[PDB]
Design an enzyme around this catalytic site. Structure first.
Site, PDB file in Angstrom:
ATOM      1  N   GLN A  76     -28.193  50.977 -30.464  1.00  0.00           N
ATOM      2  CA  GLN A  76     -27.518  50.791 -29.189  1.00  0.00           C
ATOM      3  C   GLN A  76     -26.193  50.074 -29.414  1.00  0.00           C
ATOM      4  O   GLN A  76     -26.097  49.258 -30.329  1.00  0.00           O
ATOM      5  CB  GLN A  76     -28.208  49.957 -28.122  1.00  0.00           C
ATOM      6  CG  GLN A  76     -29.650  49.812 -28.153  1.00  0.00           C
ATOM      7  CD  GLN A  76     -30.174  49.081 -26.906  1.00  0.00           C
ATOM      8  OE1 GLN A  76     -29.807  47.975 -26.532  1.00  0.00           O
ATOM      9  NE2 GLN A  76     -31.097  49.770 -26.262  1.00  0.00           N
ATOM     10  N   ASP A  88     -23.799  49.109 -21.638  1.00  0.00           N
ATOM     11  CA  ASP A  88     -24.609  49.415 -22.768  1.00  0.00           C
ATOM     12  C   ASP A  88     -24.820  50.916 -22.901  1.00  0.00           C
ATOM     13  O   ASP A  88     -24.881  51.609 -21.887  1.00  0.00           O
ATOM     14  CB  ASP A  88     -25.910  48.650 -22.739  1.00  0.00           C
ATOM     15  CG  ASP A  88     -26.736  49.032 -21.541  1.00  0.00           C
ATOM     16  OD1 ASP A  88     -26.553  48.382 -20.522  1.00  0.00           O
ATOM     17  OD2 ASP A  88     -27.571  49.973 -21.743  1.00  0.00           O
TER      18      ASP A  88
HETATM   19  C1  LIG Z   1     -31.932  46.288 -24.525  1.00  0.00           C
HETATM   20  O1  LIG Z   1     -31.605  46.869 -23.261  1.00  0.00           O
HETATM   21  C2  LIG Z   1     -31.507  48.296 -23.056  1.00  0.00           C
HETATM   22  O2  LIG Z   1     -31.858  49.015 -23.973  1.00  0.00           O
HETATM   23  C3  LIG Z   1     -31.127  48.780 -21.687  1.00  0.00           C
HETATM   24  C4  LIG Z   1     -30.434  47.927 -20.819  1.00  0.00           C
HETATM   25  C5  LIG Z   1     -29.972  46.541 -21.195  1.00  0.00           C
HETATM   26  C6  LIG Z   1     -30.128  48.351 -19.531  1.00  0.00           C
HETATM   27  C7  LIG Z   1     -30.509  49.598 -19.069  1.00  0.00           C
HETATM   28  O3  LIG Z   1     -30.195  49.931 -17.887  1.00  0.00           O
HETATM   29  C8  LIG Z   1     -31.192  50.451 -19.931  1.00  0.00           C
HETATM   30  C9  LIG Z   1     -31.534  50.046 -21.223  1.00  0.00           C
HETATM   31  C10 LIG Z   1     -32.228  50.964 -22.040  1.00  0.00           C
HETATM   32  C11 LIG Z   1     -32.583  52.242 -21.582  1.00  0.00           C
HETATM   33  C12 LIG Z   1     -32.285  52.663 -20.286  1.00  0.00           C
HETATM   34  C13 LIG Z   1     -31.604  51.785 -19.447  1.00  0.00           C
HETATM   35  O4  LIG Z   1     -31.267  52.101 -18.198  1.00  0.00           O
HETATM   36  C14 LIG Z   1     -32.684  53.936 -19.848  1.00  0.00           C
HETATM   37  O5  LIG Z   1     -32.407  54.292 -18.670  1.00  0.00           O
HETATM   38  C15 LIG Z   1     -33.340  54.816 -20.720  1.00  0.00           C
HETATM   39  C16 LIG Z   1     -33.713  56.096 -20.302  1.00  0.00           C
HETATM   40  O6  LIG Z   1     -33.437  56.516 -19.077  1.00  0.00           O
HETATM   41  C17 LIG Z   1     -34.392  56.951 -21.159  1.00  0.00           C
HETATM   42  C18 LIG Z   1     -34.658  56.510 -22.441  1.00  0.00           C
HETATM   43  C19 LIG Z   1     -34.297  55.245 -22.879  1.00  0.00           C
HETATM   44  C20 LIG Z   1     -33.630  54.383 -22.019  1.00  0.00           C
HETATM   45  C21 LIG Z   1     -33.254  53.111 -22.439  1.00  0.00           C
HETATM   46  O7  LIG Z   1     -33.528  52.692 -23.667  1.00  0.00           O
END
Ligand SMILES: COC(=O)C1=C(C)CC(=O)c2c1cc1c(c2O)C(=O)c2c(O)cccc2C1=O
Ligand SMILES: COC(=O)C1=C(C)CC(=O)c2c1cc1c(c2O)C(=O)c2c(O)cccc2C1=O
Ligand SMILES: COC(=O)C1=C(C)CC(=O)c2c1cc1c(c2O)C(=O)c2c(O)cccc2C1=O
Ligand SMILES: COC(=O)C1=C(C)CC(=O)c2c1cc1c(c2O)C(=O)c2c(O)cccc2C1=O
Lengths: 142, 142, 142, 142
Positions: free
Chosen positions: B104, B120
């Protein structure tokens, strides 16, 4: 399902380091074309040596997790994820001691019940990024 | 180095779940545009809620590891890797209970010593692959 | 196959810039949660505005190619690849004029024949790498 | 900058198919360990054969674009993106005729002004996805 189970046994060897029974599921003629530059040539012994190399390079805590296994005819495709730590020299690069994870795809041909043709495709680029984009030293890889 | 340390404190909150001190390093005006669809709006409370959501979704064993942190002016870029387990509903998809890992990138603007602008970029595609390409249920996400 | 064809019509709009007929296949209640920070709100007009934004940002030569489209119930998943050129400001980053390509996954819910719920997952990290890891300027994104 | 220019000349050969001058920038001892399974062995001729193979496999319209080139000592790292079309047999897989693009990293050692050690890391997994996850036929690769 037979062929899926053979490939799961191969995956398990990387996870446990267990090579005493490789002649039961690795074909005499086994070859992975990536192994040649290490000196690792054909059959069950070559596969045993490859298991050893993976664990020596990516540590005794390396884990290969299964996402899914597909088959078509005599071919099996394994979608895996490797979790490891760079603790051995890799293509001329000293160990960074960095943890990493990367998806991998393996393609294997089963011949009379045993793995004969084996190609693997690591996420090399993602691994290198996670290792901090290492460089080979003066000794290099050859 | 000050700004790198502020971002490391943010990373640490995701790793420990510790939100009692977020007002010391999250700007009153903090906004991450991704959080809005959850109801999570601005400032230190929004960031606390985001930490909570990450741990609820990707488990109390989620780990964010640092590859490298860069800065330019008031901007900081964090190259991280998330290790988690899909234990909470995610965009309408019930929990698969599958482990995953994905790189990430976070981009943050520091304003008077605190994180104010935060974007992010998860490896969404790789996460979805590792989760076995899940689907939303009839309830969906909205 | 009906639902696959609706999603192909959406893909085609990004490839041609054609928005005169969006009310025929975009639900009155359409929402893509990513669009909100641009000011782009709901229904066919929001989708038209999104097409405009994609072409303004990634150029009138942007191409979205289809790898495969899957469906389950009212849900459709599109595996695409975007080919573009960074010619418009992107999250506060001036245009690099760099070509790029990246896989993308879209997930859409069809409601009475029209796209109502739409999420997309670009390969943001790979795009940023190919753009030379750009930074926002002092103006930033907010 | 000398070494960066040598690697740009190598990149250019893949883009033009021009191999008449490879002895000017490819070391007598050149080896890319990936080429061995094709029969392609060492020196300028091996590199010429590799250029040929890339264009035969990924078409005469294949394009290798430069993101960035780094050096350290005698080592050069090239961050590229390949754009191609699967028009030749690839690891036992008949041509899908599908377009694709994928980042690639090359690592080269320069020895007395010429490329001697060459490793490349394609985005194999992303290429395979974009090709629709092809399979080898009964003939396979060996
Ligand atoms: C360590 O934080 C994140 O990974 C993160 C953060 C801070 C804020 C977010 O809004 C998301 C994620 C991670 C994340 C998704 C976030 O919205 C997501 O929608 C998401 C997804 O929709 C499908 C697969 C993986 C996803 C994520 O790893
Ligand atoms: C679980 O096994 C592997 O990941 C693997 C195997 C079975 C055989 C191999 O030859 C390699 C790898 C993994 C691997 C590399 C292998 O050769 C490699 O060269 C490699 C590399 O050169 C740079 C980064 C990561 C790498 C890998 O993860
Ligand atoms: C073909 O459309 C898209 O790729 C797309 C759409 C439909 C809607 C969006 O909101 C975004 C993108 C693509 C995109 C980004 C979008 O918001 C983005 O923020 C984005 C980014 O912030 C950095 C690198 C690449 C990006 C993208 O390719
Ligand atoms: C621009 O060159 C390459 O991409 C390349 C080179 C120089 C040498 C090689 O040996 C390979 C590739 C690319 C490549 C594969 C090469 O062996 C490959 O096996 C390969 C593959 O097995 C499956 C998908 C994509 C692949 C590739 O893009």
């Amino acid at each position: 399902s037979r062929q899926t189970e053979i490939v799961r046994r191969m995956v398990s060897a990387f996870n446990t380091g267990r090579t005493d029974d490789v002649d039961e599921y690795i074909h005499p003629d086994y070859l992975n074309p990536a192994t040649l530059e290490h000196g690792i040539h054909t059959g069950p012994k070559a596969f045993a040596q490859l298991v050893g190399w993976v664990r020596a390079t990516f540590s005794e805590e390396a884990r290969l997790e299964e996402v899914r296994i597909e088959e078509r005819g005599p071919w099996v495709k394994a979608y895996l994820v490797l979790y490891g730590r760079h603790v051995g020299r890799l293509v001329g690069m000293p160990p960074t001691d960095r943890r990493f994870s990367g998806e991998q795809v393996h393609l294997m041909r089963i011949v009379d019940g045993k793995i004969r043709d084996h190609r693997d495709w690591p996420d090399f680029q993602g691994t290198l990024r996670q290792l901090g984009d290492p460089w080979p030293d003066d000794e290099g890889w050859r």
